């Protein structure tokens, strides 16, 4: 959801602090808000995807470099006479951004320009230490401070990699606690609020 | 009290950008000035790497000069709240 710069407590789990954006869990839940927010348009109907039409859109902002609306409609099948809510359309409008997995192709272009990945294949790395990288470079920012939180959790060479090319700002609000029990909610076709009243 | 590299996400945080809300306008905005362009800086201190036209020996130089300069902003900001009696 809503990002900002500073460090906060969050608003679930007041102890917690905010997860980092550049993260793979808070990307995967702005993806999924984002996912269970999408309304189609059409003849003066309105109406949410299936679970079928988010389950194909799931994997593609991890595939691609960007998922935008264009290739959202083109992936769906929809016809013309369909559009989407939200979408301002008075521009190609929709070349737009629908989601983008920012963290996960920052860190897989580190690996493949370095030699340790190649091009159009999968990061293979936890969501667990994704999440670690996104965080100790969202709250550090020389190298003394981000070897310190990584050192002892992923590879030297992979960490060289990411200290060559590696940049990540802005903090969800919501903690990492949190989303960790909101996110597989979420992922099984739940929205925003029954997740956080289901849990709070 | 003191501002390093290594603790700068855990004071300038949004909590204690709130506590600048007892100090009066003409006191209170320039400190905020201070408190947000530091963690402009702190933030994107590493976005030299991003660029592929710098060595990463000179994105190196810049990394630490923009912490340094964020650092130094942050603890001004502080100091100059704590002289207003604001407690950190």
């Known amino acids: 959801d809503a990002v900002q710069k500073m460090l906060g407590h969050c608003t679930f789990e007041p102890a917690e602090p905010k997860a980092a954006k550049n ?38 902002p991890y595939r691609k470099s960007k998922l935008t609306y264009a290739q959202a409609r083109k992936l769906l ?32 272009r580190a ?21 670690e990288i996104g965080t100790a470079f969202s709250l550090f920012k020389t190298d003394e401070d ?36 909101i996110v597989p ?13 289901e849990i709070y | 009290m003191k501002i390093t590299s290594s603790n700068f996400a855990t004071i300038a945080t949004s909590e204690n950008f709130a506590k600048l809300s007892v100090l009066p306008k003409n006191h209170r905005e320039p400190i905020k000035g201070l408190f947000k362009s530091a963690v402009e800086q702190f933030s994107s201190a590493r976005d030299f790497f991003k660029n592929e036209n710098y060595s990463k ?20 900001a502080i100091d100059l709240a704590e002289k207003q009696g604001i407690q950190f």
Not at chain 1, 23 to 52: M, V
Not at chain 2, 57 to 76: G, I, M, R, S, T
């Open chain 1, 77 to 108: 099948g929809l016809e013309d006479t369909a559009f989407f809510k939200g979408l301002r359309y008075g521009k190609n409008a929709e070349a737009s951004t629908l989601m983008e997995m920012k963290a996960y192709h920052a860190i897989s």
């Open chain 2, 57 to 76: 020996e000179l994105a190196e130089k810049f990394n630490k000069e923009a912490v340094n300069e964020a650092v130094e902003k942050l603890q001004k």
């Open chain 1, 23 to 60: 993260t793979y869990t808070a990307e995967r839940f702005i993806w999924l808000t984002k996912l269970n927010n999408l309304r189609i348009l059409e003849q003066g109907s309105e109406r949410p995807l299936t679970d079928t039409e988010r389950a194909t859109l799931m994997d593609e």
């Open chain 1, 111 to 131: 690996l493949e320009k370095e030699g340790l990945k190649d091009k159009k294949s999968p990061l293979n790395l936890s969501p667990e230490l994704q999440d």
């Open chain 1, 185 to 197: 909610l979420m992922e099984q076709g739940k929205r925003y609020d029954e997740a956080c009243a």
């Open chain 1, 146 to 181: 981000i070897t310190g939180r990584l050192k002892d959790r992923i590879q030297p060479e992979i960490l060289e990699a990411l200290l060559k090319h590696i940049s990540f700002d802005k903090f969800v609000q919501i903690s990492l606690k949190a989303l960790r029990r």
